[PDB]
């Protein structure tokens, strides 16, 4: 009966996909094809969720050493990379923020500012997340903003606006409002990361590749110039993504259904919302030393990130350059200082004798370890590490050169068709791997092809470089996606269905504003500059 | 003001110890001394638990890049090493055993074997852990045995013979019987790991070091001779450790409250306990397919552990030699298979058309990720990776070489005094670091030192090599202690107080059986062999 395929399809996928994909390993000899078999099987498992994502990410530990691609000691060391430590520490700091109930105060403040309208709050949070991710790592901003969204949605639930999770092992199903807000936060982080060189590591990666490959090039990826090029498109597809997400979940253009909850809130969100919200903000009372310390540490951590090799002034990484200190150090420092510092300071009454009451016990610190263990989604370690290790295995096993050579054959296509196909290929490749890895795979081949067919290298590289960050479909596509799927349990199916929109929006906007606005930014993009001719003649 | 110390001593230590230890950094200029300061502060925090051990273990991530010892990326990747992946996977496999309630079945079987007497069960469990750790890694055996010990304690408590936990934010305080059993398992693993050259990585490490420095040596530390030397002493001090644990946590030689409970529970442990246990075992149905598959996978994992590069015969790691598999593949493979393999296998009724109820849904795997996240102590990742990171930073910064050069000055002592002091130093050093790291630090220095004087190199290397695994005082001294502390919440003070017994017992036992039995196993140990004379002359 069809019920067998309806119920055990996950097990059928698990049992059959390796056997069905075995021919790619059998009919070809090099280790590139063994690694391609592994990648294809892992991607198929990721898409269908035949196994838990965290479990599927464990597969490289078994596959790589057996296939001879890398040693098991190396493969495990590719997990728990520096950026993974940064992500985990950021989650810990967000949990510390939540523990002192600072997130509730911040959410009350922002709702008091905006006006308790779910559409207006959604727009404001999306815009602030985009502007913030313009300067800080995307996953850092996502882990930052998850508790704020949780508190805002909790307040909306308290006002009767909506239900956070669907009413009933399997974790609770998030509601369309919850999906909208969280997916919007993730998408805003991803989009805002592209507006500035500091915005994400992919921008630095392909900017450095372009600079090293092409010296004496008239057109520069200077810090203000890159912003001038990217901010218009960034804003345009950010607003378009916000409009699409509102249409997909809250029925912005559809009054038939799914807008009733927001329409209801709009009718009764005039004055009762204001009174309840400002009374509740009065209820919390003055800012306690607990929240003061947590907020001071948080602001310190954010600034400490931002001043690490910004490129516009001497960051603290240029100082203390004995060893390469990356952004994991400040985060773990904040996590440790959370435990080291106390939360009362009431014990000073011993020396001062001014205060009457005495704690009569050990004063609790800013956070407890049992809180961290209970709330941290520890599987994200395996998921993000698996992404990094899969990227490294793709580098070493030779998949990189294979895909790069496969990309060369597109020389026959015309100019605009070539640009569109390159953007599509970049999006498709970055859907299944770390963004920096995909940029490393794709950019040099694009540069050589551009020199081959007499095209300005930027005309192909820069749109493709920005497209490498357009990851919106799977939790494994980019760390913000994994963080959102972990903080609020979000399934992959509806996530990909939602992300089918921003992909098209970003592709179209990037193509259009390349072809039009890049000429304004770079007057000689369409033509072939002299230095490009010199490099082509040399090669 | 005494209550001020009595209530705020932990944070006072936190605030004062770095300032008091700062002269270590200020007075001496080398980076080895900065690393020494970091290690001293971390050790002081470890001993007093002024911070949670997991939080203290995070300190290297911040400290090493700041002091220039190592880069941030390398320090973070030192954590979650291959061996730590093995340990965490072993914990996950133990959880898989627990989920199918196999641990209760095994505990009931053992109770039937021995006869429901806590003294006799403790003795039997200690000896079984001994024998199994003779061939497998100590941490693997500890993770294996922890669920079985939990099950047997639960069965005893259900008989009403003992209480697992004391009466009640902090985790429950374990009772005397729980401490006795768990510390017995940890100590037995650590002891039995020294019986055989395969028992622990430290044995292979110092055997390889000795074989490298000295070649053409008539005395061989091969598989049979090493066992012949080690088994008698290992038996003696493990029996003495069992006696000490019985004497301390219970009243074996003292008439105490613990003596009364043991005898009163042994009075009803003759036939009534046997009948009750047999009935309880028969209450469990026939060993089901879920437990069948868990047992098969577990036995396969153990066999892969043992059959991976043993000296006796050619192992599976010798083939597939493109990359060194190094034991991480079997454990993660077992975890993955536990997630893939079904449990009921009743779905096959469709193809067979035999008949019966149908699943009406997906058949669950052997384990669930929610159970893994809830029960795995994830701080163990930081705690165990801290040891590896600290060892690597110590050897790169030069602390290890500093300690080795410091130990040279002991050559003025007489031979017996030299042996005693060397064993004491080895125990004290291994109390604060990984056993392999301590062996790498001390053994070559010991070899050169024994060449300097006219002393057989084995006479010093082998006793100290065995002693390097004699760590029983702190959870950070050796992985089994950390796993036992994580599984059952054992405060560092209790384990430190229990560690005097095994420490003194093993020190005296090693002294006596070296000086006596080593002559029988290795004749001419007292004298100076010709090859040693040639090696000393060539210096
Ligand atoms: C050394 C490398 C090879 C190792 C091979 C190990 C084999 C171990 C023994 C396998 C025993 C099971 C064999 C199939 C049993 C009958 C399957 C019936 C059809 C089917 O798939 O039903 C599902 C069960 O699948 C299942 O039971 C699938 C189980 C997992 C099979 C994985 C096979 C991997 C092969 C890899 C080969 C690699 C070669 C190159 C290196 C229903 O499942 P459900 O939906 O009810 O539940 C899903 C989990 N919750
Ligand atoms: C890298 C350093 C960065 C420093 C940045 C500025 C920090 C400013 C604030 C520091 C603390 C100000 C004083 C607070 C009151 C202390 C009173 C005495 C100690 C005391 O009562 O102990 C606990 C409070 O400890 C505490 O309050 C301990 C606070 C943390 C001290 C950390 C010292 C690090 C020194 C690093 C030196 C590096 C040198 C490099 C050349 C009481 O609490 P309790 O024990 O009852 O309960 C468990 C804790 N909640």
Author numbering:
A (entry chain B), B (entry chain A): 33 to 200, 214 to 584
What text comes from the article?
The I’m Not Dead Yet (INDY) protein in Drosophila melanogaster is a homodimeric plasma membrane transporter composed of 590 amino acids, belonging to the family of divalent anion–sodium symporters (DASS). INDY recognizes intermediates from the tricarboxylic acid cycle as substrates, with a preference for the dicarboxylate form of citrate at pH 6, and the anion exchanger inhibitor, DIDS (4,4′-diisothiocyano-2,2′-disulfonic acid stilbene), strongly inhibits its transport activity. Therefore, our biochemical characterization confirmed that INDY is a DIDS-sensitive H+/citrate symporter that predominantly recognizes citrate in its divalent form.
Apo-state structures of INDY were determined under two conditions: using nanodiscs at pH 6 and 8. At pH 6, INDY exhibits two of these conformations, outward-open (43%) and asymmetric (57%). This configuration allows the substrate to access the binding site from the extracellular side, while preventing its release inward (left). The ability of INDY to adopt multiple configurations in the apo state highlights the intrinsic dynamics of the transporter independent of substrate binding.
